[PDB]
């Protein structure tokens, strides 16, 4: 079939590539509104930090290389401005020429993702971070202005990664956030090490703080404080790129996301939606779920490829919401329903804090593991782990447990790989099971 | 009930402790033939390497402390020399006085573990490593003789740990092993980095090599080579501590181990056996299993405690055989049936070699992950991972999958925790799944 894809990055380019793996005949075209396809979204903060300096790590392909290798046509600087689902075309704006045209499709795959929110100030020194265009512009602004002091706004994983990278680059960031609710995917009382790592490095932060006014480099804050900054990076949330979808027959929720079934089909025949734009359900509980992360974009890309050109019995089984961030020496990982969603269950919490590996063994660091379970059936609802070492391991194991409908009690049966550098004979995971009841 | 435990370490002291958690009234006595209870078996190589300096790390308890904290009586230098099972007593030799006596029991728990094998040479420079007495003697001998050149016999994981520790202490070890099957719980082709790490450090080794004769410090080998060594550590296997059991009604297998049911009961009422002495079965396949490792000792200890003083419906579900060792920069982990046991199944093998984490993120290294599955039912039979980073995480996840008899195909659904320092959007685990079709 003739396949059109909207968005040429984590969901879209991946999906198109996966289809080509299965189907060498179909015409495939991707429209991307910005300059680059296949940029490495998750690498961006590290590019800014000069931790990642090879351009080849910043983006996988140009349209020319992608066509040469895969015979997939990608048109950059082409923005889809409407979906004409009844006539099975999309309307596309060529942004170089400022002329629009219709492109027909047999199958349409929407992976437009989200855009960064902006505070709205009229400021030449303020930047958001979403793509490689943004990344290049930030790097260039730092160099042209000999930037030293940077204000980082917001305390989600993106902002936190950007802050760390600015620091490692040798700049001097200050972090502010409008509330004390930092790193919101993690249990609020488990985020202290973020603040400790800031303090340890004498990196200033202010919570319950906001930009009030900007006058050149002079920033006035809600607290009443007045400071001078060379640059500002705003990480104040994102919004779904769905405005171009609203006039079509595609069902959107009230927040502008696209609900999909387990084949990533929208309500409209022959139109799929994947990536950050799509909403689904949890795998382990009967609740809606939105998990705007890379795993989901990639998993959906594969499922859609099977749906269109492969085994159409392959369907999504729902999200677990596994997520993770590094901040200096610490790892913050969690899986399952969000803190705010726990209230829909009768639940209990169990926790253990123990060395990631043998107590007698050097280089040890306390790992805090917390598990929430449903009192009605003992099923695991959510897990969270924070520590310098071993948090990723414990959370991935618990992700696999939740995939298999394990009860908290059965965690005593988990057979850990034990030697002194790695764990304990009764691992933190086993201890959760013992401590449950 | 009156409880007697034989052996005061990984299985025995643990089980006694777990019973006390549930039962504060029963009299519990443990007999231990050697000097120390609750020594840290797994720390011993690292004590030798002076990685563990604080000997306090090598000994968790003294009998006096155990009685003060847990009201459990532990008699060291007390060797159980017979089990009089029909009268429900054990005969105990007080090694300090060489006088024996009977101790009555309502329940008897056997955790005597295993002893080091010896090559049997008449040599004052040869040592084995099984307890803290041995570690003390080795440490003392190194100092007293200013040991430099040390011959390490045996290539099992503990000998490898001892070798690394001797090297890091500043000594010059040579490794020999009677065959080429080093680190035998791992796939033979995947053990190459052991030899690479030896080579990189110019640590000599010879496989299919054996001691022929010992003449003071002059060692003559099967190969005909003659070398002088200051010390020899023999790691040539272990044997079950069951000689004191042979006169009783307890059934032993032809190798001197004790087959137990899922309640860790022997064939004799009121007698349990746990730890290295006990044999069981696999959880995921119908085959016998012996897994002489710490996790199994600890798990059986809790199950016996529940049987005796807690919830007696709690039973063992069998072993998976999860195991791991660090050797210099590399980790070697496997789980499931042993290499030689694969031939009892119709199976296929899937493998990937990919970066432990995002390719663009610094400090990356190749992680080799291999999965064997049963062709009759797609179930995972065995998995093995080797790499500088991430092998423990992948194998623990696969242990949790196998615990649930998950299929190789379902690995595509595993929801990994992804950020650049940790994994990939399609993790190695997912790739096994995608590559299994
Ligand atoms: C700085 C940063 C760091 C991140 N780190 C992590 C991480 O460590 N772990 C993790 O799991 N996730 C991380 N993410 C999240 C991640 O990248 C997303 O979940 C993923 O990119 C979603 O894929 P997508 O296809 O939905 O959106 P994208 O990959 O953002 O691609 C969407 C594309 O569609 C284009 N588009 C939108 N509308 C139109 C239109 N009307 N016409 C044509 N093109 C259009 C956009 O320009 C865009 O290029 C990070 C994101 C950022 C910005
Ligand atoms: C150097 C070394 C490193 C190791 N590293 C690891 C590792 O990294 N990971 C892992 O999972 N396992 C490791 N192990 C294995 C581990 O320690 C065992 O699996 C575990 O100790 C088994 O518990 P157990 O109670 O059966 O035997 P043990 O802990 O050895 O205790 C048994 C005790 O019973 C006593 N005893 C025996 N007979 C009598 C008797 N007749 N009367 C009175 N007392 C008696 C013994 O003297 C001994 O103290 C290591 C072992 C050694 C020696
Ligand atoms: S924010 C974190 C995520 N970031 C992003 O995703 C960034 C944007 N990504 C993209 O634009 C796409 O994911 C790109 C990079 C365009 C995908 O193109 P690639 O060409 O690099 O990678 P492929 O997916 O095409 O293939 C790479 C190799 O991986 C193996 N492989 C992929 N998919 C499969 C399946 N389904 N089954 C088995 N193996 C698979 C193969 O090694 C493939 O190369 P081979 O030549 O097939 O071996
Ligand atoms: S070779 C690797 C293994 N080798 C060894 O085990 C060496 C010798 N081991 C032993 O002698 C015992 O394992 C000792 C060291 C005596 C300890 O036995 P326990 O496993 O019973 O642990 P503790 O009683 O010392 O308590 C430690 C912490 O774990 C909590 N805990 C243990 N068991 C449970 C159960 N069943 N349920 C809930 N919690 C449990 C303890 O309460 C304790 O927590 P803290 O907050 O640190 O006190
Ligand atoms: Cl990326
Ligand atoms: Cl229309
Ligand atoms: Cl704790
Ligand atoms: Cl230990
Ligand atoms: Cl008798
Ligand atoms: Cl039996
Ligand atoms: Mg219209
Ligand atoms: Mg503690």
Reduced to 3 states, what is the DSSP secondary structure of residue B107? Answer: strand
- From the list A391, A384, A347, the residue with the least C-alpha distance to A367 is A391
Instruction: Give the distance between the most distant pair of CA atoms in chain A.
Output: 70
Query: From the CA of A176, how far away is ligand 1's center (Å)?
Result: 24
What's the rounded Cα separation, in Å, for the pair A320 and A290?
10
At the top level of CATH, the class of B1-33+60-113+240-322 is: alpha beta
* Neighbouring C-alpha atoms within 13 Å toward the C-beta of A193: 20
User: For ligand 2, is residue B40 a contact (CB within 6 Å)?
Assistant: no
List, as residue ranges, the binding site of A for substrate: 14, 18, 21, 38, 41, 70, 298, 426
- Please name every residue paired with B420 in a beta bridge, in sequence order, or none if there are none: none
Rounded to a whole number, what is the largest CA-CA distance in chain B? 69
Rounded distance from Cα B302 to ligand 7 centre (Å): 18
- Asked if the Cβ–Cβ distance from A417 to B43 is below 8 Å, we say no
Contact A29, A103 (CB under 8 A): yes
- Nearest to residue B330, comparing CAs of A422, A393, A394? A422
CA distance A402 to chain B (A): 10
- Alpha carbons A25 and A41: distance in angstroms, whole number: 30
B294/A425 CB distance under 8 A: yes
Q: How many CB atoms lie within 10 A of CB A126?
A: 20
B70 marked as part of a ligand binding site:
yes
CB distance from B361 to chain A under 8 Å? yes
Q: Is A80 in the pocket of ligand 1 (CB under 6 A)?
A: yes
Measured between CA atoms, how close is B131 to chain A, in angstroms? Answer: 16
* Fold agreement between A1-33+60-113+240-322 and A41-58+114-238: yes
Count the Cβ atoms, other than its own, within 10 Å of residue A70: 18
Q: Catalytic residue among A42, A188, A213, A226, which?
A: A42
Q: Which residues of A are annotated as a binding site for NADP(+)?
A: 150-165
- Give the CB-side neighbour count of residue A29, counting CA atoms within 13 A: 17
B229 annotated among ligand-binding-site residues: no
SS3 (DSSP) at B37: coil
Show me where the domains of chain A are located: 1-33+60-113+240-322, 41-58+114-238, 330-437
- CA A87 to each of CA A103, A245, B88: distance values in angstroms, whole numbers, following the listed order: 10, 15, 88
Residue among A57, A392, A421 whose CB faces B422 most closely: A392
CA B78 to chain centre: 24
CA B33 to CA B81: how far, in whole Å?
Answer: 10
**Cβ under 8 Å to B: A residues 246-285:** 283
Contact A322 B417 (CB under 8 A): yes
Atom 12 of ligand 4, nearest CA residue: B14
Rounded Cα gap, residues B392 and B386, in angstroms = 9
* Residue of B361, B392, B400 for testing the chain A interface, max A β-carbons within 10 Å: B400
Q: Which uninterrupted H or E stretch holds B369?
A: strand B366-374
Backbone angles phi, psi at A90, to 5 degrees: -115, 150
- The closest-lying atom of ligand 2 relative to the alpha carbon of residue B79 is 42
d(CA B6, CA A247): 78
Nearest C-alpha neighbor of B167 from the set B119, B123, B127, B201: B201
Q: Where are the beta strands (DSSP E) in B59-118?
A: 73-75, 78-84, 89-94, 99-104, 107-110, 114-116
Helix (H, G, I), strand (E, B) or coil at B408: coil
Please, is A57 exposed, middle or buried when counting C-beta atoms within 10 Å of its C-beta (0-12, 13-18, 19+)? middle
Check if B158 has its Cβ closer than 6 Å to any atom of ligand 2.
yes
Q: Which of B36, B42, B53, B367 is catalytic?
A: B42
| A416/B10 Cβ within 8 A | no
Q: What angle do CA B210, B215, B217 make, to 5 degrees?
A: 85
Distance between CA atoms of residues A290 and A283, nearest Å: 12
Rg (CA), chain A: 23
Q: Out of B46, B297, B319, whose CB is closest to A420? A: B46
CATH class of this structure's domain A41-58+114-238: alpha beta
Give the closest residue (by CA) to ligand 3 atom 36.
B434
The edge-to-edge listing of strands for the beta sheet with B172-177 is: B126-127, B231-234, B149-153, B172-177, B205-207
Q: Does residue B384 have an active-site annotation?
A: no
B23: left (phi over 0), alpha (psi -120 to 50) or beta: beta
Report the 3 state secondary structure along A178-211: CCCCCCCCCCHHHCHHHHHHHHHCCCCEEECCCE
Phi-psi region of A113 (alpha: psi -120 to 50; beta: other; left: phi over 0): left
Interchain proximity B434–A302, CB inside 8 Å:
yes
- Which helix (DSSP H) or strand (DSSP E) does residue A107 occupy? strand A107-110
- Sheet harboring A380-387: ordered strands across? A323-327, A330-336, A380-387, A366-374, A347-355
Residues with Cβ within 8 Å of B19's Cβ and at least 6 positions away in sequence, in order, are B3, B26, B28, B304, B305, B308, B309
Closest CA to A319 of A219, A196, A403, A216: A403
Interatomic CA distance for residues A146 and B105, integer angstroms:
80
Task: Say whether B21 counts as a known binding-site residue.
Answer: yes
Cβ–Cβ of B418/A362 closer than 8 Å?
no
Decide: residue A115, CB within 10 A, 0-12 exposed, 13-18 middle, 19+ buried: middle
CB B60 within 8 A of CB B67: no
- Among protein residues, the one whose CA lies closest to atom 13 of ligand 4: B14
Contact (CB<8Å) A360/B434 = no
B243 C-alpha to ligand 2 centroid (Å): 16
The residue whose CA has the least distance to atom 53 of ligand 1 is A130
Inter-chain touch A317–B413, beta carbons under 8 Å: yes
Alpha carbon B233 to its chain centroid, in Å, reads 18
What is the distance in A from the centroid of ligand 11 to the CA of A84? 6
User: Measured between alpha carbons, how far is B36 from A51 in angstroms, rounded to an integer?
Assistant: 51
Q: Does the CB atom of residue B228 touch ligand 4 within 6 A?
A: no
Which positions 139-178 of A are in contact with B (Cβ < 8 Å)?
157
CA torsion angle B228 B233 B237 B239 (round to 10): 120
Best of B183, B293, B417 to substitute, by most chain A Cβ atoms within 10 angstroms, is: B417
CA dihedral A406, A411, A413, A414 (to 10 degrees): 90
What is the 3-state composition of chain A as percent helix, strand, coil, each rounded to the nearest 5?
30, 30, 45
Q: In whole angstroms, what is the distance from residue B430 CA to residue B437 CA? A: 12
Atom 4, ligand 2: which residue's CA is nearest? B42
Give the A window 67-106 contacts with B, CB below 8 Å.
none
Give the end-to-end CA distance of chain A in Å, rounded to a whole number.
55
Q: Which candidate, A200, A117, A187, places its Cα nearest to that of A158?
A: A117
Q: Who among A51, A325, A403 is closest to B414 (CB)? A: A403
Which residues of chain B neighbour A413 with C-beta distances below 8 Å? 299, 317, 403
Residues contacting A64, CB < 8 A, separation 6+: none
Superfamily grouping for domain B330-437 = FAD/NAD-linked reductase, C-terminal dimerisation domain (3.30.390.30)
- Ligand 2, residue B34: give the atom nearest the CA: 47
């Amino acid at each position: 079939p003739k396949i059109v894809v909207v968005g040429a990055v984590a969901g879209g380019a991946t999906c198109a590539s996966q289809i080509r793996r299965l189907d060498k005949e179909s015409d495939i075209i991707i429209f991307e509104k910005d300059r680059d396809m296949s940029f490495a979204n998750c690498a961006l903060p590290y590019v800014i930090g000069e931790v990642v300096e090879d351009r080849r790590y910043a983006l996988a392909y140009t349209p020319e290389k992608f066509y040469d290798r895969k015979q997939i046509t990608v048109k950059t600087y082409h923005e889809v401005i409407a979906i004409n689902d009844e006539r099975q075309t999309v309307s596309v704006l060529n942004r170089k020429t400022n002329e629009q045209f219709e492109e027909s499709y047999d199958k349409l795959i929407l992976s437009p993702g989200a855009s960064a929110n902006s505070l709205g100030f009229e400021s030449d020194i303020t930047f958001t971070l979403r793509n490689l265009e943004d990344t290049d512009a930030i790097d260039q602004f730092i160099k042209a202005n000999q930037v030293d002091k940077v204000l980082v706004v917001g305390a989600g994983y993106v902002s936190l990664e950007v802050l760390e990278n600015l620091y490692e680059r040798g700049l001097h960031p200050t972090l502010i956030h409008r509330s004390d609710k930092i790193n919101k995917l993690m249990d609020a009382d488990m985020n202290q090490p973020i603040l400790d790592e800031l303090d340890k490095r004498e990196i200033p932060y202010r919570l319950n703080e906001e930009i009030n006014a900007i006058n050149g480099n002079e920033i006035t804050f809600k607290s009443g404080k007045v400071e001078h900054y060379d640059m500002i990076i705003e990480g104040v949330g994102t919004h779904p790129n769905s405005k171009f979808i609203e006039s079509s027959n595609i069902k959107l929720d009230r927040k502008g996301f696209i609900p999909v079934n387990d084949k990533f089909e929208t309500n409209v025949p022959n139109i799929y939606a994947i990536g950050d734009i799509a909403t689904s359900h949890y795998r382990h509980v009967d609740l809606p779920a939105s998990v705007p992360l890379a795993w989901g974009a990639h998993r959906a890309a594969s499922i859609v490829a099977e749906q269109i050109a492969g085994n159409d019995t392959i369907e999504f089984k729902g999200f677990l919401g596994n997520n993770i961030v590094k901040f200096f020496d610490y790892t913050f990982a969690s899986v399952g329903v969000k803190p705010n969603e726990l209230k829909q269950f009768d639940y209990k919490m169990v926790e253990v804090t123990q060395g990631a590996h043998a107590n007698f063994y050097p280089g040890n660091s306390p790992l805090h593991l917390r598990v929430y379970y449903d009192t009605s059936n003992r099923q695991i609802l959510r897990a969270a782990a924070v520590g310098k070492e071993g948090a990723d391991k414990r959370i991935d194991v618990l992700s696999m447990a939740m995939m298999n409908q394990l009860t908290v009690d059965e965690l005593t049966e988990f057979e850990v790989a034990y030697a002194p550098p790695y764990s304990h004979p009764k691992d933190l995971i086993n201890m959760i099971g013992y401590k449950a009841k």
